[PDB]
């Protein structure tokens, strides 16, 4: 016995599926017409919307 | 070798493809016999010989 106790602590993580309830029209979201840009490349062309 | 241009060009049959696992999870864990995955817009379908 070394003459002192040892408290061991430990993180545990669990895969847990929650469930959430909200009131009817609790928040309010504001959206737009989404914009899009034409990023150019040599063989391709990407579009970020 | 299976010409995937023949798959990318021919008209196919519309199917609600339903399997339980994720697509990439079935893919990288090799449930199937031959895969062909491109992450962009591969132009290899466009040239015919």
């Amino acid at each position: 016995h070394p003459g002192f106790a040892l408290t061991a602590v430990r993180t545990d993580t669990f895969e847990v599926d929650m469930l959430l309830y909200s009131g009817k029209s609790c928040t309010s979201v504001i959206i737009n017409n989404p914009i899009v840009t034409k990023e150019e490349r040599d063989i391709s062309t990407t579009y970020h919307v | 070798m299976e010409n995937w241009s023949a798959l990318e060009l021919l008209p196919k049959v519309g199917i609600p493809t339903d399997f339980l696992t994720h697509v990439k999870t079935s893919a990288g864990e090799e449930m199937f016999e031959a895969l062909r995955i491109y992450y962009g817009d591969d132009p290899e379908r466009y040239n015919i010989h």
Binding site: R41, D42 | M1, G40, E44, H49
Partner: protein, 300 residues
């Protein structure tokens, strides 16, 4: 000028054009920078020679021009040299992972170990060999390792250098093991060793008298793990130099700020002169990497 047309003396079957059509946006070396070119000087097959020198292939490849492979259509190739600065895309077959942030260099390819020896093009005797596109730290690592191989191995019998290079030729870089095929000494490698020895002699000479004893001071002050390894290395070098006790340093007499500025600026010049042996300039700066690690978009 820009778009470079190549040809083929032999016909391509459907298999040949099929394995060519998956080589789009692959970088191939061209030695000539001319327009109506021919396929035998295309690639490295005219320049590849086993038991001739990897460093020769390295020097000629870094002297060679580079171009991008796009749009075969049957007995036509359409090589296009990438302009300096504009974003392009690349497609590498070299079994080495990439990164969205690092830089690239171009090296003559090594054997990975499975030994496939089929780069998906062969015309009779003629084959296609593609230069490996390698991320910058692996590139300077293999450069410095062949430099240590050339610098160490002089005037030694085969067994001691064999025991050195069985563990020196292997490089494990991001879960991938590579070995250098042809480490054979060269007159060009001799002039690299010449520049190396002159540069390290010059940084031995004009270094300050306090920097020659600085690690002794930090040894007497502080003990850290890398400092413990540094004291191990330096005291082993000292006892290989002298069995006497290395004395403690006192107040340094010649303290002069302009002197330190001048001698350390010349020192930085000489370290640049030594590092430019192994520090290769970049060829590609990554904008994006594909998730299957096959293709990328690089800005050069």
């Amino acid at each position: 000028e820009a778009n470079i047309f190549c040809t083929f003396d032999h016909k391509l079957s459907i298999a040949d054009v099929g394995k060519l059509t998956k080589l789009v946006a692959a970088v191939v070396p061209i030695p000539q920078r001319l327009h109506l070119i021919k396929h035998y000087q295309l690639g490295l097959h005219q320049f590849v020679d086993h038991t001739r020198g990897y460093v020769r292939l390295r020097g000629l490849l870094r002297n060679m021009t580079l171009t991008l492979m796009r749009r075969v259509e049957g007995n036509q190739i359409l090589l296009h040299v990438p302009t300096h600065g504009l974003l392009y895309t690349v497609l590498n077959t070299g079994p080495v992972t990439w990164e969205k942030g690092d830089a690239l260099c171009v090296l003559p390819p090594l054997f990975h170990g499975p030994l496939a020896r089929e780069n998906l093009l062969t015309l009779g005797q003629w084959e296609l060999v593609l230069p490996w596109i390698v991320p910058m730290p692996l590139a300077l690592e293999i450069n410095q390792r062949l430099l240590i191989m050339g610098l160490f191995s002089l005037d030694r019998s085969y067994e001691e250098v064999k025991a050195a290079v069985q563990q020196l030729q292997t490089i494990t870089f991001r879960d991938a093991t590579f070995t250098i095929p042809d480490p054979v000494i060269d007159q060009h490698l001799l002039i690299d060793m010449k520049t190396a020895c002159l540069s390290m002699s010059m940084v031995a000479n004009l270094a300050s008298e306090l920097t020659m004893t600085y690690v002794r001071k930090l040894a007497l002050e502080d003990s850290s793990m890398l400092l413990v390894k540094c004291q191990e290395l330096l005291m082993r070098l000292d006892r290989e130099r002298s069995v006497g006790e290395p004395r403690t340093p006192a107040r340094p007499q010649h303290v002069s700020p302009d002197d330190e500025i001048a001698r350390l600026s010349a020192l930085f010049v000489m370290l640049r002169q030594l590092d430019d042996l192994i520090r290769e300039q970049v060829v590609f700066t990554v904008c994006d990497v594909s998730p299957d690690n096959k293709s990328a978009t690089c800005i050069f």
